[PDB]
């Protein structure tokens, strides 16, 4: 698999932190999901993870 395609694919679902790639917050927490421990909406979880 070409490196450019993998890079373009990972740029849409991940962010660069200290040279490494961390998955985006909205990917782990969909809009209809909630915190399994507190039940807060997924938007707050995404803001906290960001």
């Amino acid at each position: 698999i070409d490196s450019v395609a993998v890079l373009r694919g990972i740029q849409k679902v991940a962010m660069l932190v200290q040279g490494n790639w961390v998955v985006k917050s909205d990917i782990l927490y969909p809009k209809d999901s909630s915190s399994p421990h507190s039940g807060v909406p997924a938007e707050v979880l995404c803001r906290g993870r960001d």
Partner: protein, 49 residues
Amino acid sequence: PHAAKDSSDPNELYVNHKVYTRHMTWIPLGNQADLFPEGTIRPVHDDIL
């Protein structure tokens, strides 16, 4: 009445949610108010949950 939109921590959402022993109020009987000055009759640690 005034809290954040999320307020995940119970401290911001609710008030008096943890009943500490400091809420105990000594009620004088008869002349105990005159014999005992204010602040003497009270819980020892004042922080027991």
